[PDB]
Design a protein around this ligand. Structure first.
Ligand SMILES: C[C@H]1O[C@@H](n2ccc(=O)[nH]c2=O)C[C@@H]1O
Ligand SMILES: C[C@H]1O[C@@H](n2ccc(=O)[nH]c2=O)C[C@@H]1O
Lengths: 264, 264
């Protein structure tokens, strides 16, 4: 995508040499924002082939409030293996905070039903936010939330959403984070009978690992391809009743996939 | 300021007509980001005179973890009167979340000392965040946090900071929110022996009230003036030991102040 290749370029020209946790060097910038009008097509990077089936399964797993790897394993989605313990537990990460934020007085707040309530009954609200940055539970999580906070917005029958991402690997992680959230805006919108608007991505420490330079130069050689179209084949009775098979991506013709190795 | 007058202009040309809580119309945009290099001068709007003494007193009140209006009243700072109850309580708003975030298991987390710890002992961290969006305490607060979340960043001896603001009145509220946070970056930096970097402002629903149009047209007539210089006269033994008198703004020559009325 134009906006993503423009960000790759900006990290190469402007990033400072910053290191990662006792490891790999990165070229890093702080504070970046991009906008994707979801009416123009689904924001899946076409300059390298991306596989959406793990993205869909991870999103539907978050909406169930699930913190264990079992569901993902039943579908042979293995993206969280690296963080899970011996029982498949990841601690109170995303799904638990989205669906059951624990209060000091023993309540569990379902921020996803709150947000639907607000989009339907109070759409002009400037408080339509779900947060996964629960400070009192960060020590028990396998990793602190990268996509920590997001806000919905409704104007002229269109639902927009801004994601704050505290940390971002532009090569490996970001194409996956944009598709996952753009998919959530389409599901939210379908349920509130609203059209899709913008997905605004805001990042904090936005970086490229040093051992992904050959791959970032190769991808910047490629011309972007027309963006695909997401079709949802069914309208579920609620946001918690979607299935893997309900989604189809139409017209996706990417360039070949590029591998990116990681240090250990 | 150039970046602020450019945002005022963008809300007038691009904002949609959106209403406020059972009230006033607004022209509104969603998702905006501005950058202020704090080495170029202190980001206090010069196209209208702004009074910094309430800003300083409110910031030092937040750092004490104070949720009652008494301190502000002792200094005849009256900006929070509208929200306080009969005893001067505002509920668990900002200061309480910054200094004593309550956990489910009875702890109180001091996010401001955590952040100093990280800037000194682990400055390359991508997790140096303080959050005031405590979902389980939002019902007891006088108002939900507008400046909800912020992240620090260190690269090349320079401390930067990004603020996420869910809601923003561009005329009345934003010049005050930029100065308050730019002042916190200078205090943090002094305490960690780092230089100042950038203040990146990110907003969510960024708006102009309809009954501030004459005033926004008047301010856009004015040419910006050279930015002032903040001098801190003393280095306190910690971030909690600053006093009103430690700060001076040097070289501030604004245009006259403009009044902005509010509906009730
Ligand atoms: C932890 C490293 O992986 C990155 N990362 C992790 C999770 C995610 O959703 N997106 C992302 O980009 C952040 C940092 O570069
Ligand atoms: C509640 C109204 O006042 C605005 N507001 C409030 C507090 C603050 O720090 N900044 C700000 O701009 C948000 C919205 O426009």
């Amino acid at each position: 995508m134009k906006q993503y290749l423009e960000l790759m370029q900006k990290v190469l020209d402007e990033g400072t040499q910053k290191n990662d946790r006792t490891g790999t060097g990165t070229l890093s910038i702080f504070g970046h924002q991009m906008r994707f009008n979801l009416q123009d097509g689904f924001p899946l990077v076409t300059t390298k082939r991306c596989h959406l089936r793990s993205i869909i399964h991870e999103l539907l797993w978050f909406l169930q409030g699930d913190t264990n790897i079992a569901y993902l394993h039943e579908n042979n989605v293995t993206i969280w293996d690296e963080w899970a313990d011996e029982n498949g537990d990841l601690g109170p990460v995303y799904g638990k905070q989205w669906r059951a934020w624990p209060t000091p007085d023993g309540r569990h707040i379902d921020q996803i039903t709150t947000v639907l309530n607000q989009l339907k009954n109070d759409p002009d609200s400037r408080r339509i936010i779900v947060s996964a940055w629960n400070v009192g539970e960060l020590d028990k999580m396998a990793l602190a939330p990268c996509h920590a906070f997001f806000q919905f917005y409704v104007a002229d029958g269109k639902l927009s959403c801004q994601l704050y991402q505290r940390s971002c690997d532009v090569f490996l992680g970001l194409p996956f984070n944009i598709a996952s959230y753009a998919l959530l805006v389409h599901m939210m919108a379908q349920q509130c009978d609203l059209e899709v608007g913008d997905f605004v991505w805001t990042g904090g420490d936005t970086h490229l690992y040093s051992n992904h330079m050959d791959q970032t130069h190769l991808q910047l050689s490629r011309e972007p391809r027309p963006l695909p179209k997401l079709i949802i084949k069914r309208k579920p009775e609620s946001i918690f009743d979607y299935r893997f098979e309900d989604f189809e991506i139409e017209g996706y013709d990417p360039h070949p996939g590029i591998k990116a190795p990681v240090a250990i």
